[PDB]
């Protein structure tokens, strides 16, 4: 069905995202578990970690356009990556080595993230119909990596420990650039322009310069996230004046002001949402008892199922406004559960959770895989930009509003903590509707606009 | 995933007797442990627990007499049991549940111990 460096760039993508999820979904419980953390520190660290791993995509791309060449820096950035997760496995031996690490986790990822998408767009003839299949299943590749990592990460760190779970993120690393590397000759042709001259060492030094440098700021940002929040309000705001000073573009800000939002509440997965599922949920589906960790997997879960169903079945204001929808009855879901379905020992069925999961999943699809392909349509490397640094500014928000639902060391009672949770996953889910109905109010005239 | 109780036995009332749970595979460190009773013709109750960051949990019938602790290097939990009284014969069963929560019914944890008898006599 698909050309041959397809489906060599679908099982890369598969193991690169099996490896950053097998850590993502542990490492809110890791910061409590193991550094000792409280859930708010947890949450917030969290949160400047994504924060990093998502500013920094901007850069990768640039890299793998202007300086190294797509391929190059494919190789570059997952051998960053897999050192990453090495560093994170020997930290449970030097625990001052975490943050480094997980620097060295945002780092890789900016550098790899947008450059196999990048190789894909070049596989096929410019206008070949197969794209938009072939991109669906680029992004069910991303979730069947994910939906392993989320699903079997947390059996292996409660059975092996966390050393062995890292160290198995770096072997899937690690086996993706064997892949790509027993791969090479179905991608000879394709690439960037930099990717056929010859590399320029100049350009690689200064790379793996600007790599090292922006590791040990990420470690410091994440171990002092109270700077972190000070340089990305004053970033923001001073983006902000810059991009107010510089009728198609209004468009792409006010739908980036929502992808925020989006952001804010997909941010919930590993952290509110993870821990409302440990403490208030049955860990028990179908007869089976879980790791409650594990429920994080729903959501790629829903995306493999959903996206191929959704490729088959307005416009750009309206898709963003039906996400926003189906993110708010999310938690307004979550909220409900938790408020009128719950055991009298304060513990809820964990359906509840697989449509809370089914709604966030679906609120992804409609504004997560379509947000850039057509922010790009409206408007350049600008927006790209100041687009990933809202999309950190979210994820640092995300954190600081989790901590809303941070439950103390000593508490023991689920019927103390379902209130909490109630009382924020419901104000999110009113604020996120109060937004989705503003979105709506405002889609005829940004229909006209992106005219 | 499986657990393993050890300490029951037959005591006069007033001695001390200590229970101990231990687990296979799983690192029991990340798991509240709840002590369950069941005495003759009753429903298990819970009787005490601690999560898995050390917040504790009692029944109010066997507070000041009980004490629930845990040894992380060992990956073991244990229950204390002082000043034990007749009405605490029963078969005690350690149950496992991840988290920090300890939930009141035995339908809040996955993983059970087989059960110790304990005898206080009078």
């Known amino acids: 069905q698909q050309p041959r460096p397809f489906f060599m760039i679908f099982f890369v993508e598969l193991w690169e995202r099996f490896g950053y999820y097998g850590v993502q979904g542990v490492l809110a419980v890791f910061f409590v578990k193991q550094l000792g953390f409280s859930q708010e520190q947890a949450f917030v660290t969290f949160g400047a970690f994504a924060a990093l791993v998502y500013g920094l995509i901007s850069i990768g791309g640039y890299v793998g356009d202007h300086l190294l060449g797509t391929k190059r820096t494919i190789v570059l950035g997952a051998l960053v990556l897999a050192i990453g997760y090495f560093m994170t496995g020997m930290s449970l031996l030097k625990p001052d080595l975490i943050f480094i690490a997980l620097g060295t986790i945002a780092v890789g990822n900016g550098l790899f993230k947008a450059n196999p998408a990048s190789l894909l767009s070049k596989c096929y003839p410019p206008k070949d119909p197969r794209l938009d299949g072939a991109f669906t299943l680029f992004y069910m590749s991303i979730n069947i990596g994910s939906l392993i990592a989320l699903s079997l990460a947390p059996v292996i760190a409660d059975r092996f420990g966390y050393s062995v779970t890292y160290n198995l993120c770096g072997a899937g690393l690690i086996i993706a650039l064997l892949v790509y590397i027993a791969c090479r000759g179905m991608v000879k042709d394709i690439g960037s322009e930099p990717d056929f001259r010859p590399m320029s060492f100049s350009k690689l030094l200064y790379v793996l310069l600007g790599s090292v440098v922006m590791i040990f700021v990420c470690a410091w940002l994440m171990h002092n996230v109270e700077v972190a929040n000070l340089v990305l309000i004053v970033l923001s705001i001073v983006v902000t004046i810059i991009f107010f000073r510089q009728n198609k573009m209004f468009v792409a800000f006010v739908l980036m002001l929502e992808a925020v939002v989006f952001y804010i509440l997909y941010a919930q997965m590993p952290t509110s949402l993870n821990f409302f599922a440990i403490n208030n949920v049955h860990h028990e589906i179908l007869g089976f008892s879980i790791n409650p960790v594990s429920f994080q997997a729903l959501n790629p879960f829903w995306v493999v199922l959903a996206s191929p169903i959704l490729a088959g079945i307005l416009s750009m204001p309206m898709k963003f406004t039906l996400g926003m929808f189906m993110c708010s009855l999310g938690f307004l879901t979550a909220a409900a559960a938790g408020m009128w379905f719950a055991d009298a020992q304060g513990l809820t069925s964990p359906w509840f959770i697989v449509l809370v999961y089914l709604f966030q999943s679906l609120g992804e699809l409609f504004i997560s895989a379509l947000g850039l392909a057509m922010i790009a349509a409206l408007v350049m490397g600008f927006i790209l930009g100041m687009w990933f640094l809202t999309q950190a500014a979210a994820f640092l928000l995300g954190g600081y509003v989790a901590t809303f639902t941070a439950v103390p060391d000593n508490i023991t009672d689920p019927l103390e903590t379902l209130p909490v949770y109630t009382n924020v996953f419901g104000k999110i889910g009113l604020v996120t509707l109060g937004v989705a109905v503003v979105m709506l109010l405002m889609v005829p005239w940004l229909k006209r606009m992106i005219a | 995933v499986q657990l393993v109780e050890s300490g029951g036995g037959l005591v006069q009332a007033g001695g001390s007797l200590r229970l101990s749970c231990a687990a296979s595979?799983?690192?029991?460190?990340?798991?509240?442990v709840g002590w369950f009773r069941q005495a003759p013709g009753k429903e298990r109750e819970f009787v005490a627990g601690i999560n898995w960051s050390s917040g504790l949990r009692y029944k109010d019938v066997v507070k000041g007499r009980f004490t629930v602790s845990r040894d992380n290097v060992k990956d073991t939990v244990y229950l204390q049991m002082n000043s034990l009284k007749p009405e605490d014969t029963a078969v005690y069963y350690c149950?496992?549940?991840?988290?920090?929560?300890?939930?009141?019914?035995?339908?809040?944890?996955?993983?059970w111990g087989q059960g110790t008898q304990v005898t206080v006599s009078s």
């Open positions: 595979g799983p690192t029991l460190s990340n798991y509240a």
């Open positions: 149950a496992a549940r991840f988290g920090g929560m300890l939930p009141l019914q035995p339908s809040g944890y996955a993983n």
